[PDB]
Amino acid sequence: NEDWVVNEPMQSFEENPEYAPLNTIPDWVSEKVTPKEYELWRTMSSRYEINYSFLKKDISEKRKKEIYDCINNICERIEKGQINKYEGFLNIADEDGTAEYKTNGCTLYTHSLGPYIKAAVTYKKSDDDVTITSSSVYTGSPYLGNDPSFSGASSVSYDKDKKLIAASCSGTLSFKDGSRKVEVTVQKTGFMIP
């Protein structure tokens, strides 16, 4: 069992279930935003597979400005022909802070049998810039017995145009499915609104 996964749109809802498939928005979302806002998300969903978990929490006005200023800028580039292709996944970090000191994370891949590759990032956000202090890629499973293992490369950087953090991996996920060894080459990218 050798297999290859790349940075392309999902085939079913089930592949990375925490994220909305392209050109869809979970129904519940439409009750948490204005038509103006909803319309930006519609544009955004044409290029990103989006996790809306952040709307399940009280967001300050300072934060709403951040999130929408960001999305607005990205939509302009989508509209201008500039972000013309599938990008990857998108998460919106919480307001939880500590210039502020934050962690955010990102599920880059989830095998149907359960094992996953996740990215975590620690950074400092200020008026002007975002700076990465730490970055991790890790693996695991909801089921005991997989012993997943990831070998290969990953990267993290802040895109100053899109104003997003990009975390990528390119490597091999190995795990046990009982007596069967599974190896999957995984190349994925997830974006984060800092």
Would you say how long the chain is, in residues? Answer: 194
As to burial, measured by CB atoms within 10 angstroms (0-12 exposed, 13-18 middle, 19+ buried), residue 40 is: buried
Short-list 110, 46, 103, 37, CA closest to 78: 46
* Residue 187 CB contacts under 8 Å (≥ 6 apart), including other chains: 5, 6, 7, 168, 169, 170
DSSP secondary structure, 152-167, as one string: EEEEEEEETTTTEEEE
Task: Write the residues followed by a gap in the chain (C–N more than 2.5 A).
Answer: 98
The string of DSSP letters for 6-47 reads -SS--SSGGGSTTSBPTT---GGGGGSS-HHHHHHHHHHTTT
Rounded to the nearest 5 percent, the helix, strand and coil shares of the chain are 20, 45, 35
Q: Specify whether the CB–CB gap between 167 and 75 falls below 8 A.
A: no
List 110's β-bridge partners, or say none: 116
Instruction: Tell me the structure's resolution in angstroms, rounded to a single decimal.
Output: 2.6
Give the DSSP per-residue string, 116-145: EEEEEEEEEE-SS-EEEEEEEEEEE-SSTT
Give the separation between CA 114 and CA 41, rounded to whole angstroms. Answer: 29
Residue 17 CB neighbour total at 10 angstroms = 12
List the beta bridge partners of residue 132: 123
What residue segments make up the domains of the chain, in order of their start? 1-194
Provide the residue type at 110 as one letter: T
Q: What whole-number distance in Å separates Cα of residue 126 and Cα of residue 53?
A: 23
Phi, psi at 56, each rounded to 5°: -90, 35
Can you tell me the distance from the alpha carbon of 15 to that of 162, in angstroms, rounded to the nearest whole number?
26
**CA pair distance 125, 132, nearest whole angstrom:** 9
Q: In whole angstroms, how far apart are CA 93 and each of 53, 101, 116, 186?
A: 9, 12, 20, 24
Method: X-ray
Q: 118, 137 in Cβ contact below 8 A?
A: yes
